[PDB]
């Protein structure tokens, strides 16, 4: 699906997270899988009650993610082209 492909297109850019536990992890996205579980680098953390800390590396489970904020300039990214023309696939 497109929503996950946009998350793969956001690698290496600052993103925000909301876990369903209520916390907020904002920082740079290193890895993401098709299970939506991502790992982030040099991230600032906001606990559900507002206490903010800083951690260098984090890995979160995709099932616990609520929304992900992605740099706005990915809006016009080619994933959202409705009528697009692909070439023929290679024969293997």
């Amino acid at each position: 699906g497109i929503p996950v492909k946009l998350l793969n297109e956001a690698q290496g850019h600052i993103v925000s997270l909301e876990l369903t536990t209520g916390a907020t992890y904002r920082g740079k996205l290193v890895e993401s899988e098709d299970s939506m579980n991502v790992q982030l680098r040099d991230v600032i953390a906001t606990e559900p009650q507002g206490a903010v800390t800083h951690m260098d590396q984090i890995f979160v489970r995709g099932s616990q993610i609520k929304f992900i904020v992605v740099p706005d300039l990915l809006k016009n990214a080619p994933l959202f082209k409705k009528n697009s023309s692909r070439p023929m696939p290679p024969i293997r």
Partner: protein, 124 residues
């Protein structure tokens, strides 16, 4: 206000500003762009609105004015697990005819790309 087509599914509606309800009682309002099998969708310019615990007593049964604390977060990707129901707020910046026009021009340009690529690959 706004009348949605009597039969319109989530695929028919794109670029409409929507209003999304999650399990936690907060709302994400913005333009829908994509969605998926399990219904996690992508909003363009979206603002999460929240009724504070202090304003909530005002909604219990007895003109009400609720102070809804909201914060702006652009180009998000929601999760289908959290989504509860979806409502339509507005209709897109472009009319239906204009969207047909841009769709046709976009398709023609797309074909021109395939020809310009094919004949740039073939001779060299």
């Amino acid at each position: 206000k706004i009348q949605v087509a009597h039969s319109s599914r989530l695929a028919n509606l794109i670029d409409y500003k929507l209003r999304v309800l999650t399990q936690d009682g907060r709302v994400y309002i913005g333009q829908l762009m994509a969605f998926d099998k399990h219904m996690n969708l992508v909003l363009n310019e979206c603002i999460e609105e929240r009724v504070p615990k202090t304003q909530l007593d005002k909604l219990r049964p007895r003109t009400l004015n609720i102070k809804v604390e909201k914060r702006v977060l652009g180009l998000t990707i929601l999760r289908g697990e959290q989504i509860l129901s979806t409502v339509v707020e507005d209709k897109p910046l472009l009319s239906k005819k204009e969207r047909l026009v841009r769709d046709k021009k976009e398709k023609k340009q797309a074909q021109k790309q395939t020809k310009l690529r094919k004949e740039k690959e073939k001779k060299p």
